[PDB]
Amino acid sequence: VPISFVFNRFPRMVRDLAKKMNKEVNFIMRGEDTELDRTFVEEIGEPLLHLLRNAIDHGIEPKEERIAKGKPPIGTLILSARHEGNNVVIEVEDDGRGIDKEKIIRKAIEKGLIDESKAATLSDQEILNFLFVPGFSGMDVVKNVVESLNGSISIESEKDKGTKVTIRLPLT
Numbered sequence: 001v002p003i004s005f006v007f008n009r010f011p012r013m014v015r016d017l018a019k020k021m022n023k024e025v026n027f028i029m030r031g032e033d034t035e036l037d038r039t040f041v042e043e044i045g046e047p048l049l050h051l052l053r054n055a056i057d058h059g060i061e062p063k064e065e066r067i068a069k070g071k072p073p074i075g076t077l078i079l080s081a082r083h084e085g086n087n088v089v090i091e092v093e094d095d096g097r098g099i100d101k102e103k104i105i106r107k108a109i110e111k112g113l114i115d116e117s118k119a120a121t122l123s124d125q126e127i128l129n130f131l132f133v134p135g136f137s138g139m140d141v142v143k144n145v146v147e148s149l150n151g152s153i154s155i156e157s158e159k160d161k162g163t164k165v166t167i168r169l170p171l172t
């Protein structure tokens with residue numbers, strides 16, 4: 001099917017969550033005509049809804065805070081799909097407050113998953129990959145579904161700039 005069968009549900013879910021959270025959100029959908037196998041279409045909805053929720057709750061800041069930080073007042077959330085070879089790539093991007101890598105390291109140390117000495121040299125991707133650890137605090141459940149579809153997921157984020165989650169699905 002076109003992924004529009006999934007993506008057409010999201011503007012409703014996104015305004016509803018924005019109203020509940022007192023966030024002003026500019027939601028943009030691109031690539032909705034991108035076609036993929038029915039099994040992916042019937043399963044990819046729940047993971048995507050989780051990522052959109054995360055963007056609106058934890059990423060986009062309220063307008064007053066964005067103005068105070070010198071950002072464009074209304075936060076933007078972009079959900080896109082495209083073909084890459086025989087794969088489909090789906091991205092959820094926001095221009096919100098990002099993921100705080102220092103907080104992740106602190107939590108990791110508190111949980112005994114790494115010591116201070118080793119935290120100093122972790123890469124960005126190694127740090128963000130703690131988010132997929134079960135119970136870390138979720139992104140594990142999103143990963144579980146994606147992996148069940150033989151997909152991969154990655155996260156890029158920077159503090160104050162925003163977050164991009166990318167899901168790559170096979171042709172299957």
Ligand SMILES: Nc1ncc2ccccc2n1
Nearest residue numbers: 054055058059098099163
């Ligand atoms: N999009 C987004 N933005 C901030 C987050 C902060 C914590 C965890 C997930 C997040 N995801």
